[PDB]
């Protein structure tokens, strides 16, 4: 690959492994690593226990390569029609993940990077103000971590 | 920062369902699994390399390199590369136990240097990290 490829990919590998090993002993590579792990765990639990009791939002979107942010935003808003809470933000991440998997399942690989940018924009415009006034991601970790 | 959370979660989720956000996605997961296996099954059978390093704030790369060399004294193989990562992880946990969290980024830098200098040329000739995945990744499905 390109000149720095090995440098980036080795660093990615080292940080991932060290983050994992520290996490297993109740520590963390960084505060951001603690947030990521808590979100991974919360998303898994949402999918295991709570998701099937709600209507399937992926059915509402019916994503295609012609799909733009505006459609994604309108569907995601349904999650927060009764307001923001941490569980609903968790469902939001899980939704994004399910869309990505579905897109690959259906040979629409182009959507994965698209969805990633959709989510970042939705977070910044719609969820960050609530996050900052509700203790930040550090509070999420205290409530959802382990 | 919100982007960093998005990227991590999507990548974790995709790998869970068999897909790769980036080239290292399947490698990270196989390495995590291989490391757990090594620690559970193997580690107790070798001499503890962390005892030889006795890491302190004064420890530099040279000391780390001299100790890790013992792992590869009979050559490189994937098993020893797994042990190498496990070793790095153990030094990091040990550093935090001893309230020396500052050492963690230094150990990570040491690992990247050793990996590039001493391990990567072997990895590149032995089919890259995808080969590690082929051999050490979960192949229970293919076996079925
Ligand atoms: N102890 C660890 C833990 C982890 C996760 C937990 O989640 C609890 C449920 C979170 C939600 S989700 C929610 C909500 C509100 C409105 C709507 C929804 C959900 C809807 N969800 N539909 C979805 N369909 C999909 C499809 C794929 C992936 C995610 C989703 S979410 C459709 C209708 C609109 N409302 C809430 C809530 O608690 O208020 C709890 C505990
Ligand atoms: N199915 C998935 C899977 C995953 C891992 C596997 O590993 C097999 C053993 C790996 C090693 S380790 C090894 C070796 C060779 C020379 C030495 C050592 C190990 C030594 N290890 N000492 C260590 N002390 C520590 C302390 C903490 C963490 C890691 C270590 S490793 C010290 C003496 C010199 N030589 C080998 C080898 O296979 O040749 C196999 C299968």
Word description of this protein:
The structure is a homodimer. Chain A has 146 residues and is mainly α. The first copy, chain A, is 73% helix and 0% strand. The first copy, chain A, has helices at 5-24, 31-50, 57-61, 69-77, 86-105, 110-133, 136-144. Chain A is globular and about 40 Å long. Chains A and B meet through helix 1, helix 2, helix 5 and helix 6 of A and helix 1, helix 2, helix 5 and helix 6 of B. One ligand X0B is lined by residues 34, 37-38, 42-43, 46-50, 70-71, 77, 79-80, 82-83, 86-87, 90, 136 of chain B. The PDB classes it as apoptosis. The entry lists the keywords apoptosis, inhibitor. It forms a dimeric assembly.
Compute the number of structural domains of chain A: 1
What's the number of helices of chain A?
Answer: 7
Cα shape of chain A: globular
The termini of chain A sit apart by 38 Å
Number of strands of chain A: 0
Using CB atoms under 8 Å apart, which protein chain pair has the greatest interface? A-B, 41 and 41 residues
Whole-angstrom Rg of chain A = 17 Å
Structural class given helices, strands, pairing of chain A?
Answer: mainly alpha
Heteromolecules bound: the ligand NCc1ccc(OCCCc2sc(-c3ccc4c(c3)/C(=N/Nc3nc5ccccc5s3)CCC4)nc2C(=O)O)cc1
Q: Tell me about the largest β-sheet of chain A.
A: none
| Oligomeric status | homodimer
Share in helix of chain A: over 70%
Order of helices and strands of chain A: HHHHHHH
Strand content of chain A: under 5%
PDB class: apoptosis
Keywords: apoptosis, inhibitor
Assembly: dimeric
Entry title: Crystal structure of BCL-XL in complex with inhibitor (WEHI-539)
């Amino acid at each position: 690959g390109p000149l720095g490829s090995m440098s980036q990919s080795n660093r990615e590998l080292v940080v991932d492994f060290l983050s994992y090993k520290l996490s297993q002993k109740g520590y963390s590579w960084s505060q951001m690593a603690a947030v990521k792990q808590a979100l991974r765990e919360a998303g898994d639990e949402f999918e295991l226990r709570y998701r099937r009791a709600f209507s399937d939002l992926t059915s509402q979107l019916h994503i295609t390569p012609g799909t733009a942010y505006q459609s994604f935003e309108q569907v995601v808003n349904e999650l927060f029609r009764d307001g923001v809470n941490w569980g609903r933000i968790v469902a939001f991440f899980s939704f994004g993940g399910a869309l990505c998997v579905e897109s690959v399942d259906k040979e629409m690989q182009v959507l994965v990077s698209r969805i990633a940018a959709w989510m970042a924009t939705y977070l910044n415009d719609h969820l960050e103000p609530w996050i900052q006034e509700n203790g930040g991601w550090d509070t999420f970790v205290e409530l959802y971590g382990n």
